[PDB]
Amino acid sequence: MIKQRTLKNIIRATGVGLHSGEKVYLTLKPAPVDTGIVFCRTDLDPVVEIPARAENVGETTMSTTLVKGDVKVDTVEHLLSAMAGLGIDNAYVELSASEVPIMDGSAGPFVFLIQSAGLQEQEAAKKFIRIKREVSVEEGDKRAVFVPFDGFKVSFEIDQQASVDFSSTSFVKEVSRARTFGFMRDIEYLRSQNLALGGSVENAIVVDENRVLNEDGLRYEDEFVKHKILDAIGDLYLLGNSLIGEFRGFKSGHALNNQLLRTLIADKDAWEVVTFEDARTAPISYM
Numbered sequence: 001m002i003k004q005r006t007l008k009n010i011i012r013a014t015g016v017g018l019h020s021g022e023k024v025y026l027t028l029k030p031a032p033v034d035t036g037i038v039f040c041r042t043d044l045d046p047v048v049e050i051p052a053r054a055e056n057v058g059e060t061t062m063s064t065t066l067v068k069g070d071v072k073v074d075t076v077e078h079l080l081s082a083m084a085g086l087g088i089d090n091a092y093v094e095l096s097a098s099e100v101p102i103m104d105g106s107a108g109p110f111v112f113l114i115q116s117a118g119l120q121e122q123e124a125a126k127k128f129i130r131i132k133r134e135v136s137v138e139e140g141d142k143r144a145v146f147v148p149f150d151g152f153k154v155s156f157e158i159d160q161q162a163s164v165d166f167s168s169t170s171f172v173k174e175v176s177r178a179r180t181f182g183f184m185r186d187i188e189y190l191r192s193q194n195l196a197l198g199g200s201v202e203n204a205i206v207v208d209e210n211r212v213l214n215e216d217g218l219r220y221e222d223e224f225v226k227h228k229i230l231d232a233i234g235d236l237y238l239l240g241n242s243l244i245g246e247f248r249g250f251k252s253g254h255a256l257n258n259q260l261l262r263t264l265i266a267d268k269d270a271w272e273v274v275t276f277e278d279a280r281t282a283p284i285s286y287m
């Protein structure tokens with residue numbers, strides 16, 4: 001069957017939060033069947049543990065932020081995108097500060113870390129959620145939609161357009177390395193308000209409103225929209241189970257992505273859990 005997956009070994013990384021500029025240790029730990037992804041702030045006294053699910057998303061300014069009371073874990077989207085990408089169902093993530101490290105601005109480092117810990121298949125069927133009926137949410141000129149589709153595909157447009165199928169196209173090769181990005185004008189403002197403190201050309205693409213300022217250039221011709229697809233995959237993983245359907249994003253950010261998840265969850269007629277006792281017949285394959 002398509003089994004649930006966790007990490008083989010504990011693995012650690014160090015980095016800096018994009019927004020906070022704070023040094024943070026990130027420890028990924030194997031977890032048992034039906035755990036999901038749980039975060040653990042190990043700097044707080046007492047430690048605060050926060051499941052990576054839709055209901056725990058509290059703020060959605062420039063990143064997905066998990067909250068419990070007055071305690072936050074923000075910028076979970078790139079790490080969760082890596083998890084989704086490698087099909088990791090269960091893991092503990094222990095963090096020494098409020099923000100996940102930015103690493104190189106992409107999911108690449110996290111993908112490589114997860115693989116370096118080794119994957120461990122677990123003897124329990126992996127539960128997917130099938131989209132049975134179209135579900136969409138909008139607000140102004142933003143739109144977020146799930147459409148039925150026997151597989152998993154993402155199409156996204158921003159202010160430009162990319163479509164990726166995760167049967168034909170490798171998350172690792174074509175999406176994982178896409179770095180976050182910002183406009184100088186924006187970056188200047190955020191720095192003035194004590195934000196983006198961990199930002200640099202080493203973990204973010206910088207453009208004015210003309211050209212890429214990074215000396216070494218782009219990793220993909222359409223890196224910007226590819227990164228937005230990466231973010232949506234991460235935000236969609238807060239569902240807590242892998243999706244069988246097509247997601248269409250039109251200028252959709254963290255807030256509207258979480259709103260789509262909430263609507264889908266509450267609209268039970270639109271979805272159903274399914275497992276695959278035969279990996280050959282399954283619409284989604286992992287490594």
Ligand SMILES: O=C(CC[C@H](NC(=O)c1ccc(C#Cc2ccccc2)cc1)C(=O)NO)NCCCO
Nearest residue numbers: 062063180181182183186187196199200201204231
């Ligand atoms: O939609 C987006 C991108 C999606 C977003 N990234 C961000 O917010 C984001 C914010 C700030 C930075 C920076 C910086 C820096 C670079 C060099 C020196 C000093 C500082 C990079 C990314 C993200 O990755 N969300 O998950 N708009 C660009 C935001 C600003 O125009």
Ligand SMILES: [Zn+2]
Nearest residue numbers: 062063231254
């Ligand atoms: Zn964002």
Ligand SMILES: [Zn+2]
Nearest residue numbers: 077180227231
């Ligand atoms: Zn991002």
